[PDB]
Paper text:
Recently, bioinformatics analyses have revealed the presence of CRISPR–Cas loci in bacterial Tn7-like transposons, thereby implicating a functional relationship between RNA-guided DNA targeting and transposition, with the latter representing a new role unrelated to host defense. Support for this concept has emerged from recent functional studies on type I-F and type V-K effectors involved in sequence-specific DNA transposition, thereby significantly broadening the potential biological applications of CRISPR–Cas technology. To complement the available functional studies, our efforts have focused on structural studies of the Vibrio cholerae Tn6677 multi-subunit type I-F CascadecrRNA–TniQ complex, whereby transposition subunit TniQ initiates DNA transposition with the eventual help of other transposition-associated proteins TnsA, TnsB and TnsC in the gene cluster. Here we report cryo-EM structures of a V. cholerae type I-F CascadecrRNA in complex with transposition subunit TniQ before (binary CascadecrRNA–TniQ) and after (ternary CascadecrRNA–TniQ–dsDNA) target double-stranded DNA (dsDNA) binding at an average resolution of 2.9 Å and 3.2 Å, respectively.
Cas6 and TniQ can be readily traced in the 2.9 Å structure of the binary complex, thereby providing insights into how the three Cas subunits (Cas8, Cas7, and Cas6) of the multi-subunit type I-F Cascade are assembled in an intertwined helical topology with crRNA and TniQ. The binary complex reveals a 1:6:1 Cas8:Cas7:Cas6 subunit stoichiometry similar to that reported for type I-F CascadecrRNA complexes, but contains a head-to-tail aligned TinQ dimer, whose individual monomers are bound to Cas7.1 and Cas6, so as to facilitate the first step of DNA transposition. The complex is assembled with a 60-nucleotide (nt) crRNA processed by the CRISPR-specific endoribonuclease Cas6 from long precursor CRISPR transcripts (pre-crRNA), which contains 28-nt repeat sequences separated by 32-nt plasmid- or phage-derived spacer sequences. Following Cas6-mediated maturation of crRNA, Cas proteins are assembled with crRNA, with the 5′ end recognized by Cas8 and the 3′ stem-loop held by Cas6, which is kinked by Cas7 thumb motifs in a periodic “5+1” pattern. Cas6 binds to the 3′ stem-loop of crRNA, while forming multiple polar interactions with Cas7.1 (left insert). Notably, the binary and DNA-bound ternary CascadecrRNA–TniQ complexes superpose with an RMSD of 2.33 Å. Minimal conformational changes are observed on ternary complex formation in the presence of bound target DNA, reflecting slight opening of the entire complex and crRNA, especially within the TniQ-bound end.
Residue numbers in the entry:
A (entry chain I): 1 to 188, 193 to 265, 270 to 350, 360 to 391
B (entry chain J): 1 to 188, 193 to 350, 360 to 391
């Protein structure tokens, strides 16, 4: 099998790429192309040829149950041999990853960007028909929730045609023609959703902060946890218009709520929601995680105020490893040599001011250290 | 106790800062200032006041054995109370850290920069007397090996006066006057050491790569491991003048050397028997961020286009379960789980049951991150 690479685009999704390779190389559809691709992987003795799908929907490596390592070996084999000039196909796929969010949400990764798993669309993929007839392909941003408007046309996305039928471009091509009525779909204008769509796309959108793309999706997942509901585009832009003193206003109202509802107060009894729900979003890089960077800025100037209220909050050995980013073996070693001053791992024997100053002594890094929020 | 902050400088060392606070606040030396500082920490009921040293040599928190957590609480207490305007003193100290280098070298951290532990000077600290009489303080770069010339005066550092006596600024002040002869020290000019000194200082030095300061010291420790000797300033700049095709020339010569001298059947070849030196000596320098670790980023670039060439020579290299966790950055509990559900295809942990091409593609499937992923060396 010998193929031709189409016009490359670094924002094209993986399912939109196989349609354009099949249409350029004269195949009938993408079902035929993947079935002929599985035939080629059999002929050169690939170990997981039989797990290569003929369905466009399950092509991505998060779809594969145990073929995840054989799927990316299959994707790396095709880009090196079957093309006149080697394409980029691993950079368009959505891989699983071991990275977790706060508190326990898993994640997926696409090239140089990490997405939340819960914000991945799985029922029906919306689309913009203006991009389908100008760019000629589909973007990866249509697979994730929150991205509701087009960042370059300011038009809302479509999930249903005028005849009640849905339109999925993976099964109905890239042209924009419906299946039942075989007609182009008629379109269905705000500003707050347009700003977030231009912000999630990777461009500078004010007043939203200039963050890497892995961190911009972490704030959207974090904002859905604060309101404890779905994502609101209006209150999200307004919250960062008063940055950082709007985020300071919440933490004051949370500690006034939990004090009224004192030497026995724990860290999970006063700051159990804000602190543990902001550690890994996606990681502890305080240069880019502005939520954990500002929360540690607020708790630094309040350690020994109010007779040491914050610095005397009790902690376990489990939740000490979450803050210090270490293991229970190093915690049990630091009670042997007693760098950390007092074993039951679920026992409250440590104070927050001692854990905060142990981090400034033995557990800083080049990314998780205090020198960014100064 | 009420003190005055001197002129602040973000490159001043910690031992040079306490001398300038004591000289501004009218103390006699730094020995009577730290001893008066220990007296203040006793008066406000600090838990580790009795471990606060009166020696300026052991003022850094890596010198404290068990009281390293009490030392940084002592440093955080002084900056908040005893000054008219709060200084920055935790940012000048040299803390220990849990970060290891390759293969097993420990590390220290100073603010936003991680240093190798073995490159930390412990016998005698050299100095530049021109910076002592112009800037008025000392820099932290004088505490680390490799930094041999001044990056702004291009003069070699001094460890010995003209009368045979050493000059340590921690015990002899910041002026530049010797102890025996009480005279200023007479100085003792290349280019290759001047480039590395301007590169380790944090400025752009060509042809050396634009890296963060935590990674620039990692290359110097790595270059001492390749030659298996001390650091050479001439061959270091020349090696990055032919980047990356000079580093490609070594890996070709290593796999040709190892294959010819292999003691086992070409199919029984292991990853430690062919690439045991280059791969395991480049994982954590300091970490796996392939955006800035250009050694591991280029070694995985070279081994990607050679997996199934030569009848799958690289992709059939045997690995253990121990050295699978080093590459995947995981634990032995997740490895034992992936032999239960069999995402990874075959328990004795020191047994060679896995191939390198399967571990490399399992990483592209289940173990990428925002920093350790393939999308940087494309
Ligand atoms: Zn659009
Ligand atoms: Zn229709
Ligand atoms: Zn200079
Ligand atoms: Zn002299």
């Amino acid at each position: 099998m010998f193929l031709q690479r189409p016009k490359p685009y670094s924002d094209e999704s993986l399912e939109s790429f196989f349609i354009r390779v099949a249409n350029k190389n004269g195949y009938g559809d993408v079902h035929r192309f993947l079935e002929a691709t599985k035939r080629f992987l059999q002929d050169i003795d690939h170990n997981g040829y039989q797990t290569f799908p003929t369905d466009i929907t399950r092509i991505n490596p998060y779809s594969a149950k145990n073929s995840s390592s054989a799927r990316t070996a299959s994707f790396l084999k095709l880009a090196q041999l079957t093309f006149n000039e080697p394409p980029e196909l691993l950079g368009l796929a959505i891989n699983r990853t071991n990275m977790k969010y706060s508190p326990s949400t898993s994640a997926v990764v696409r090239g140089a960007e990490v997405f939340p798993r819960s914000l991945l669309r799985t029922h029906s993929i919306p689309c913009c028909p203006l991009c389908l007839r100008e760019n000629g392909y589909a973007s990866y941003l249509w697979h994730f929730q929150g991205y509701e408007y087009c960042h370059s046309h300011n038009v809302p996305l479509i999930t249903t045609c005028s005849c009640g039928k849905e339109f999925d471009y993976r099964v109905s091509g890239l042209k924009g023609i419906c299946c039942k009525c075989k007609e182009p779909i008629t379109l269905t204008g705000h500003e707050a959703a347009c700003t977030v769509s231009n912000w999630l796309a990777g461009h500078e959108s004010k007043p939203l902060p200039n963050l890497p793309k892995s961190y911009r999706w972490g704030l959207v997942h974090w904002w859905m946890g604060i309101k404890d509901s779905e994502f609101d585009h209006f209150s999200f832009v307004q919250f960062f218009s008063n940055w950082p003193r709007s985020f300071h206003s919440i933490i004051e109202d949370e500690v006034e709520f939990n004090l009224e509802h004192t030497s026995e107060l724990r860290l999970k009894d006063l700051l159990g929601r804000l602190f543990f729900g902001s550690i890994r979003l996606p990681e502890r890089n305080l240069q880019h995680n502005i939520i954990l960077g500002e929360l540690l800025c607020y708790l630094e100037n309040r350690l020994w105020q109010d007779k040491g209220l914050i610095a005397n909050l009790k902690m376990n050995a489990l939740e000490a490893t979450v803050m210090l980013n270490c293991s229970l073996d190093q915690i049990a070693s630091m009670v042997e040599q007693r760098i950390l001053k007092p074993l039951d791992v679920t026992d409250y024997l440590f104070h927050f001011g001692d854990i905060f100053c142990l981090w400034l002594a033995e557990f800083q890094s080049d990314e998780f250290n205090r020198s960014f929020y100064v």
